Amino acid sequence: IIVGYGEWPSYCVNRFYTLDTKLWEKSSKGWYWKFPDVLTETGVFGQNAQFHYLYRSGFCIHVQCNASKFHQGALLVAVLPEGADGFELQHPYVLDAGIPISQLTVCPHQWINLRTNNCATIIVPYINALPFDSALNHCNFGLLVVPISPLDYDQGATPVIPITITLAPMCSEFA
Amino acid sequence: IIVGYGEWPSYCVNRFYTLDTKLWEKSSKGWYWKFPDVLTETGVFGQNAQFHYLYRSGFCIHVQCNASKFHQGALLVAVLPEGADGFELQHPYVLDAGIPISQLTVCPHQWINLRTNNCATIIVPYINALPFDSALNHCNFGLLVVPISPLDYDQGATPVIPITITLAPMCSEFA
Amino acid sequence: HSTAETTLDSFFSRAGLVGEIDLPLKGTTNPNGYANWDIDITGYAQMRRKVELFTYMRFDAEFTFVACTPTGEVVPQLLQYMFVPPGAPKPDSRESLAWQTATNPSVFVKLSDPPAQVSVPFMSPASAYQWFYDGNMMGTFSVRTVGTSKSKYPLVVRIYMRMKHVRAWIPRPMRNQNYLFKANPNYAGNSIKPTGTSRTAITTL
Amino acid sequence: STLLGQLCGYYTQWSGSLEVTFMFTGSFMATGKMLIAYTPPGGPLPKDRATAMLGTHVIWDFGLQSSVTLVIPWISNTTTGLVSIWYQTNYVVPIGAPNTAYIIALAAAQKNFTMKLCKDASDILQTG
């Protein structure tokens, strides 16, 4: 378990939200999600996001995939400060921002190597230059899942590997 | 303060809900409201009434009117077991049910005489032959406000007297 | 016993004639030798206004079966008198298989006997019977003459009921207008009567 | 027109709480009720009396009380909140008393109000 920047969420919708399943192929580039934009439409959190004026919350993110022992590949999961089906990266080498992907391990990160493990867990505290902001006008961070070493298998196996994201809000305020 | 049947609400949306103002004239018959039907559309109580399967709640009802010292009349406020703008009585002598109005003081009741007071308060516990029922298919009781002695004034005064109902849910459950 | 007659035990305390079924020898009333009768307590004509003084009640019942010829004569006949609980099927003919289902209790009795007498408990799924629902099955007695052929005598069967272990809650005003239906508080709105009698002037006795 | 609004024209940034007092100046014989509501920054003006009641509000009775107060929470940053007055009941009056009254509003600030970054703003008030 990775606790981001050595700090736990703290005070200044307590359930699991399994989002949807992505499909990882031999020609995937990568995906990203923006928080809290991913969750302002579903459930009780989506009501309190757009009915209140101020917002403060931390998170806990689980990333999992399941495959056989005849598949190979590696993913890099990272969290970088500043819908619910994600967007796809066009230029994953420059992370669509002009910054290299080979230095993305300066962030809270975790590897998924299919040879070794199949789950990643990152805990994110609340980060802002203000104590309270708006959930609908400001996104705090983004989640990146990029295949560094590509997927491979022999012909006859399952060509598509599931990736499921599940998350839990932790120490939320609304005012 | 009248506590109905000598019993307080108890366990087996905690705010005031000022409904609307009725207008009492020289030719009024009376009005009635059905509970919890009066409140299944407004606020947080209206959401939890139609999203849950079982229901159990008590109430506290305030009835007020304001007039000058040149008006006269009397109202009988009563609670009889078994929208938000009420209905009007067609035959108030038989209470639209074939039962006399002169024996309605066997119920939890209170008088409003404009010569003496201007407010009535009745506390109602939860009454059912079952421990839990449905809020949308079964109405527990009805509230009756009938002018026994009619309104009167001299010409030039305000011809119409306001009557406001305000209520507060007390010891509610939802399952 | 110094006000022990105004209790609710004494106010609902006598056996009254509710239900009267007829098994004629010829005609179209009951052409075969059987009849069904659904248990209601308001077959006694003074009873509906008394129980509707309250909202909830809870009681037991005790039934008595006296039977005779239309003249009054006592003849040697054997009858069946079975009880169908609520939720069970009822007989369609005399050759139905419901007459010999062991979960429907019967009382075989001769006509030259004292009247048969049974007791029925509180059988509601709720905690009380309620006479007013803003939004009450007790069972059924089937009565047949025992045989494979038709009987030789015309018979009349009368049913009496006494309530016991009575509890009641939440008093209500009593009925003011004449009834029109059953389990329905409707009234004739085009003819509404006062509660009592009238006089000519307020200053005259 | 307030003194708070004139002194904060000499500064740039301010934040704190406010308070508004209403004073009914009708006759002794008149009764009625009002509804003073407050909407937080971001939400619009309510459409009717029923939706404004579902929120921060107060009922003010004329016959019992001649003054009510409303503590507005934190305003800041040099949108804004809204205060609206609705009629709960009608205006009840006997024979021989006037049909129309007036309300006077008074406003101030709380003890946690601050101002900073002074600015002698070019006033309209020019010398001679």
Side-chain angles (χ1 to χ4, degrees):
Chain A
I1 298 170
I2 301 300
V3 175
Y5 300 107
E7 180 174 357
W8 290 91
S10 65
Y11 293 100
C12 184
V13 299
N14 297 114
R15 66 185 298 274
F16 292 104
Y17 288 148
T18 303
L19 293 175
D20 200 358
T21 299
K22 301 302 290 186
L23 299 183
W24 174 36
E25 296 176 353
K26 287 174 71 174
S27 64
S28 293
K29 299 286 183 66
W31 301 276
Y32 64 93
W33 294 266
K34 292 289 182 70
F35 293 9
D37 196 5
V38 79
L39 203 64
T40 56
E41 297 86 3
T42 68
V44 183
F45 187 80
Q47 293 180 356
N48 296 296
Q50 63 186 358
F51 287 163
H52 296 268
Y53 185 72
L54 294 176
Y55 169 70
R56 187 178 187 273
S57 177
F59 291 100
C60 180
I61 301 168
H62 305 266
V63 181
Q64 291 175 354
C65 62
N66 46 11
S68 65
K69 291 183 177 182
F70 290 159
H71 291 89
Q72 65 188 3
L75 294 170
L76 179 60
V77 180
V79 167
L80 179 60
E82 301 291 332
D85 52 355
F87 286 152
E88 293 177 352
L89 290 174
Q90 296 292 320
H91 295 105
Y93 184 75
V94 296
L95 291 174
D96 286 331
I99 53 171
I101 192 166
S102 63
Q103 304 183 7
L104 188 60
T105 65
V106 75
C107 299
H109 75 282
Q110 182 71 44
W111 286 95
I112 296 172
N113 193 0
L114 292 178
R115 193 180 192 273
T116 300
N117 53 0
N118 56 3
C119 64
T121 302
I122 299 168
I123 295 168
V124 179
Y126 182 70
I127 297 168
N128 197 0
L130 280 75
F132 288 95
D133 56 351
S134 179
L136 270 294
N137 290 318
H138 186 198
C139 295
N140 287 318
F141 61 94
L143 181 68
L144 289 166
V145 177
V146 182
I148 300 299
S149 180
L151 185 67
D152 199 2
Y153 55 92
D154 278 333
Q155 188 175 4
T158 299
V160 165
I161 297 302
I163 300 168
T164 67
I165 312 296
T166 173
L167 56 94
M170 186 180 286
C171 294
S172 295
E173 288 90 359
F174 294 99
Chain B
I1 298 170
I2 301 300
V3 175
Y5 300 107
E7 180 174 357
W8 290 91
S10 65
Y11 293 100
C12 184
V13 299
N14 297 114
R15 66 185 298 274
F16 292 104
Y17 288 148
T18 303
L19 293 175
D20 200 358
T21 299
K22 301 302 290 186
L23 299 183
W24 174 36
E25 296 176 353
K26 287 174 71 174
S27 64
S28 293
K29 299 286 183 66
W31 301 276
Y32 64 93
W33 294 266
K34 292 289 182 70
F35 293 9
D37 196 5
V38 79
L39 203 64
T40 56
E41 297 86 3
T42 68
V44 183
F45 187 80
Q47 293 180 356
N48 296 296
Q50 63 186 358
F51 287 163
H52 296 268
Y53 185 72
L54 294 176
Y55 169 70
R56 187 178 187 273
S57 177
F59 291 100
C60 180
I61 301 168
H62 305 266
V63 181
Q64 291 175 354
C65 62
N66 46 11
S68 65
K69 291 183 177 182
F70 290 159
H71 291 89
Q72 65 188 3
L75 294 170
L76 179 60
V77 180
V79 167
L80 179 60
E82 301 291 332
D85 52 355
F87 286 152
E88 293 177 352
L89 290 174
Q90 296 292 320
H91 295 105
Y93 184 75
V94 296
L95 291 174
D96 286 331
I99 53 171
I101 192 166
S102 63
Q103 304 183 7
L104 188 60
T105 65
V106 75
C107 299
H109 75 282
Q110 182 71 44
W111 286 95
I112 296 172
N113 193 0
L114 292 178
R115 193 180 192 273
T116 300
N117 53 0
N118 56 3
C119 64
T121 302
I122 299 168
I123 295 168
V124 179
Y126 182 70
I127 297 168
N128 197 0
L130 280 75
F132 288 95
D133 56 351
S134 179
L136 270 294
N137 290 318
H138 186 198
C139 295
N140 287 318
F141 61 94
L143 181 68
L144 289 166
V145 177
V146 182
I148 300 299
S149 180
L151 185 67
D152 199 2
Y153 55 92
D154 278 333
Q155 188 175 4
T158 299
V160 165
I161 297 302
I163 300 168
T164 67
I165 312 296
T166 173
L167 56 94
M170 186 180 286
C171 294
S172 295
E173 288 90 359
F174 294 99
Chain C
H1 297 83
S2 180
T3 70
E5 196 176 2
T6 60
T7 62
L8 297 186
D9 297 328
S10 299
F11 187 66
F12 305 102
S13 181
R14 291 144 297 274
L17 177 62
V18 45
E20 175 180 357
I21 58 173
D22 194 2
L23 274 65
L25 191 63
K26 64 178 74 67
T28 185
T29 301
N30 287 318
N32 294 320
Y34 70 100
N36 285 316
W37 183 71
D38 290 329
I39 298 171
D40 57 349
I41 71 169
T42 65
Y44 177 66
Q46 296 290 320
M47 201 70 205
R48 185 180 175 182
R49 188 173 182 266
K50 289 176 69 174
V51 294
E52 288 182 352
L53 179 60
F54 298 99
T55 313
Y56 301 104
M57 289 184 69
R58 185 185 176 96
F59 57 90
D60 295 330
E62 183 178 271
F63 291 92
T64 307
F65 295 93
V66 53
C68 64
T69 303
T71 302
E73 190 179 2
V74 175
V75 291
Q77 183 66 45
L78 186 67
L79 282 80
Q80 185 170 358
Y81 298 160
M82 80 171 185
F83 177 72
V84 179
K90 293 189 285 184
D92 197 3
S93 178
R94 302 183 77 249
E95 292 85 4
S96 176
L97 295 177
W99 293 105
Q100 54 195 359
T101 297
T103 54
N104 296 326
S106 298
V107 181
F108 292 92
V109 67
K110 294 177 178 66
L111 201 69
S112 67
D113 279 333
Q117 190 174 5
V118 295
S119 295
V120 179
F122 178 76
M123 296 185 73
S124 180
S127 296
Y129 300 112
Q130 55 180 353
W131 306 111
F132 296 97
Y133 183 74
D134 195 4
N136 293 324
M137 294 185 287
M138 299 181 188
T140 300
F141 284 104
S142 296
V143 172
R144 197 189 66 178
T145 61
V146 172
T148 64
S149 297
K150 191 178 75 172
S151 180
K152 293 190 286 186
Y153 303 106
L155 296 173
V156 180
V157 179
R158 288 177 179 87
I159 302 166
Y160 288 83
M161 186 186 75
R162 180 177 66 87
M163 309 200 301
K164 58 184 181 291
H165 306 276
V166 176
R167 296 178 72 186
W169 295 270
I170 302 169
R172 297 187 67 163
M174 301 185 76
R175 181 74 180 183
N176 198 2
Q177 304 293 319
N178 285 322
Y179 293 107
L180 269 70
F181 297 104
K182 293 181 181 179
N184 197 357
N186 285 321
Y187 61 95
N190 54 3
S191 68
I192 297 170
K193 299 294 187 290
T195 307
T197 60
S198 298
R199 59 183 173 179
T200 301
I202 196 169
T203 61
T204 64
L205 291 173
Chain D
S1 67
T2 59
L3 186 62
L4 180 61
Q6 294 295 321
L7 287 175
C8 70
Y10 287 102
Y11 288 90
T12 306
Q13 299 171 358
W14 54 85
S15 68
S17 295
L18 299 175
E19 56 182 359
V20 181
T21 302
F22 295 96
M23 183 189 290
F24 181 72
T25 65
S27 65
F28 185 77
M29 300 298 291
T31 56
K33 291 182 182 178
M34 289 290 169
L35 177 61
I36 295 97
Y38 176 71
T39 302
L45 185 67
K47 61 180 181 179
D48 55 356
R49 199 270 308 158
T51 60
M53 184 270 291
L54 299 171
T56 298
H57 69 280
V58 65
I59 305 293
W60 174 43
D61 196 0
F62 293 158
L64 271 300
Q65 192 178 4
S66 293
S67 296
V68 74
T69 185
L70 181 69
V71 177
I72 297 169
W74 282 80
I75 56 98
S76 176
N77 199 0
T78 198
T79 61
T80 60
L82 293 175
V83 177
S84 62
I85 296 98
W86 300 89
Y87 291 180
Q88 181 69 43
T89 67
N90 55 357
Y91 184 76
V92 179
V93 77
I95 180 166
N99 290 317
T100 302
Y102 294 103
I103 298 174
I104 299 166
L106 297 169
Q110 295 287 324
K111 299 294 288 292
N112 57 2
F113 193 81
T114 57
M115 292 182 287
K116 68 188 289 185
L117 190 58
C118 61
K119 179 178 90 275
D120 286 334
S122 68
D123 297 334
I124 305 171
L125 284 312
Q126 62 182 358
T127 64

